Every structure is written in C-alpha cells, then in structure tokens.
Design an enzyme around this catalytic site. Sequence first.
Site, mmCIF file in Angstrom:
data_model
loop_
_atom_site.group_PDB
_atom_site.id
_atom_site.type_symbol
_atom_site.label_atom_id
_atom_site.label_comp_id
_atom_site.label_asym_id
_atom_site.label_seq_id
_atom_site.Cartn_x
_atom_site.Cartn_y
_atom_site.Cartn_z
ATOM 1 N N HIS A 1 0.820 -1.208 0.000
ATOM 2 C CA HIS A 1 0.000 0.000 0.000
ATOM 3 C C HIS A 1 0.859 1.266 0.000
ATOM 4 O O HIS A 1 0.335 2.374 -0.061
ATOM 5 C CB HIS A 1 -1.019 0.001 1.163
ATOM 6 N N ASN B 1 17.721 11.663 11.676
ATOM 7 C CA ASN B 1 16.853 12.839 11.682
ATOM 8 C C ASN B 1 16.576 13.095 10.198
ATOM 9 O O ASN B 1 17.452 13.560 9.472
ATOM 10 C CB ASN B 1 17.591 14.034 12.294
ATOM 11 N N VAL C 1 17.252 16.830 8.621
ATOM 12 C CA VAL C 1 18.571 17.447 8.590
ATOM 13 C C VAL C 1 19.573 16.569 7.844
ATOM 14 O O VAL C 1 19.562 15.349 8.000
ATOM 15 C CB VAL C 1 19.086 17.686 10.034
ATOM 16 N N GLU D 1 23.814 9.721 5.196
ATOM 17 C CA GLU D 1 22.754 9.329 4.278
ATOM 18 C C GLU D 1 23.149 8.974 2.851
ATOM 19 O O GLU D 1 24.118 9.496 2.303
ATOM 20 C CB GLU D 1 21.702 10.442 4.219
ATOM 21 N N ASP E 1 0.111 -7.798 1.800
ATOM 22 C CA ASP E 1 0.590 -6.419 1.764
ATOM 23 C C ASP E 1 2.116 -6.406 1.829
ATOM 24 O O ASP E 1 2.706 -6.163 2.884
ATOM 25 C CB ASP E 1 0.002 -5.646 2.944
ATOM 26 N N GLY F 1 2.979 6.790 9.129
ATOM 27 C CA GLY F 1 4.343 7.151 8.805
ATOM 28 C C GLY F 1 5.207 5.899 8.927
ATOM 29 O O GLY F 1 6.250 5.781 8.280
ATOM 30 N N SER G 1 4.208 2.623 8.191
ATOM 31 C CA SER G 1 3.913 1.586 7.186
ATOM 32 C C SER G 1 5.124 1.151 6.352
ATOM 33 O O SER G 1 5.924 1.976 5.910
ATOM 34 C CB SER G 1 2.827 2.061 6.215
ATOM 35 N N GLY G 2 5.238 -0.154 6.126
ATOM 36 C CA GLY G 2 6.327 -0.678 5.325
ATOM 37 C C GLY G 2 7.593 -0.954 6.100
ATOM 38 O O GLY G 2 8.480 -1.663 5.611
#
Lengths: 217, 56
Positions: free
Chosen positions: A39, A53, A56, A61, A83, A169, A171-172
């Site tokens: 979904h 975070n 920021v 990352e 799902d 937020g 989900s998954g």
Amino acid sequence: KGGYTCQENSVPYQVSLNSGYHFCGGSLINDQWVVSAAHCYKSRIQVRLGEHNINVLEGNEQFVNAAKIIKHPNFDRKTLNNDIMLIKLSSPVKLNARVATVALPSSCAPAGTQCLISGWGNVNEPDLLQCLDAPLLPQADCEASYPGKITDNMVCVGFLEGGKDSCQGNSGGPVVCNGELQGIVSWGYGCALPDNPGVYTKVCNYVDWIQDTIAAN
Amino acid sequence: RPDFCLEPPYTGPCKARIIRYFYNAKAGLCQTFVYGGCRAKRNNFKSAEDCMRTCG
Ligand SMILES: [Ca+2]
C-alpha cells in the site's frame, strides 16, 4: 505513541521512502533491494538510507532512486492480504556501520517472541527514528481483536491493552525479532487503542517469493 | 453540495503518511489531512483544485 527515540544508527536496515516527503518505511535486505508494504506503492520513489533525523542532512545518508517496484501479485487493497512489495534500487548502496541489511526469516517466529519495531511518524524540527519493543501475539488474540479481518498472512504485534503501537508514517517498516525480519508494518484500527494492536504482514510466508523475485530481476 | 463533502476526513487503517485534501464544511474550503494509504472515503482529494471543484 509509546515508542522511544532509537539510538542513532542503531537500526541500520531501516529506510525512508520519499516522494517529496517521508510517507513510508522499508527494510534493506540486500545491497540493491528493499522490502516494504504494497500500500506504500507510488510510481516514483526515492529511498533514503543511513537516516536518523530525516529533516537534517547529517552526513551518513545515501539517496537512491527506485528502479523497479514489484507488489505482491495477490495484494488486495481492501483486505490488505499480501501487503508486501519489493523495490530494486537504481544502483547498489554502500554497506557500512550505518547502512546494513537485515536477514529474512529462517522460519515463522512463535507467539511471545519479543521484537523491535521502528519508523518515523506524523521543516527544521527534528524527526527522529522511533523504536518500540513488543511481542508477537497469538493468532487467536489477533483474530478476537479484528473479527473476520485476519488472514494467515498477518500477525498482530503489540499489547491488547494498547498504549504502545506503530502509527501513520510507520507503514512498510520492519518488525525484527532475533535478528530476522518477521513483519512489515501494515494496518490497525487507530493506533495504541486497547483491543486493537497493530497488524503486520507475516514475512515468513513470503521468503521464497522474495528470493525468486530478486533472482529473476 | 454532496453529502460526502460534509463528512470528516478519514485517515483509514493503513499506516502510511500521505497528504491529501478534504473539504472542510466549517471552514468553507479544502485543507490537508493525513491519509493512511488504503480504504479512502470520497472526501479525499489528490489536489485542492479537484476538492474545490467537487465540493465547492
Ligand atoms: Ca538526515
């Protein structure tokens, strides 16, 4: 709510799915593949790894675009049965201390097993990864909480008394127990409500589909 | 206007965080709300334009 902020980079397999803003979570299972909920499908998805975070730029990352998005062929948008969805990244990511993979289940974890659920919830304010320690509940309790709505591909994780749960937020995202990905955040009636713990995709029922799909793509 | 335009926004049981628009009867206009990703009701639009056209 009920969670606590995770220790920075303590959940290295956790990813954030972003299409302009954070809308879903996911798990890195190998250097070029991510597992999430069906979904959470969007035609264009950017995967963000090594995040803590999400508001920021911290330096650890990795931003990678999704090249292929494959939803389970029997996914039902109404019942949420099956799902699950796979995302192949544009290029392999660099695995390090802050970006690593999580193991697929060797078998289905028994009710009572303690697990770790993680995710970001609902522009300069800190949006930090949240964590929650919770047990897999017996199927009968899951079924009693959601009469006629639980299939063999779902499992409840949490507390029947509410208070602690995953929410929008999340989900998954991953439900990891003993180092293995056993669940994917899927749905629930509200969040942290008594008699309605979170429902999760039971990953152990899909290991072969996942492996077969990765090999063929 | 249609009855579904007067209904409060519905997040649904799924746990995604998707921003959608809904017509706010008290405000007289469309605002955003967090949609969960599944089982949307009719007062749920991907754009304000659509929302205002259908429920304005
Ligand atoms: Ca960041």
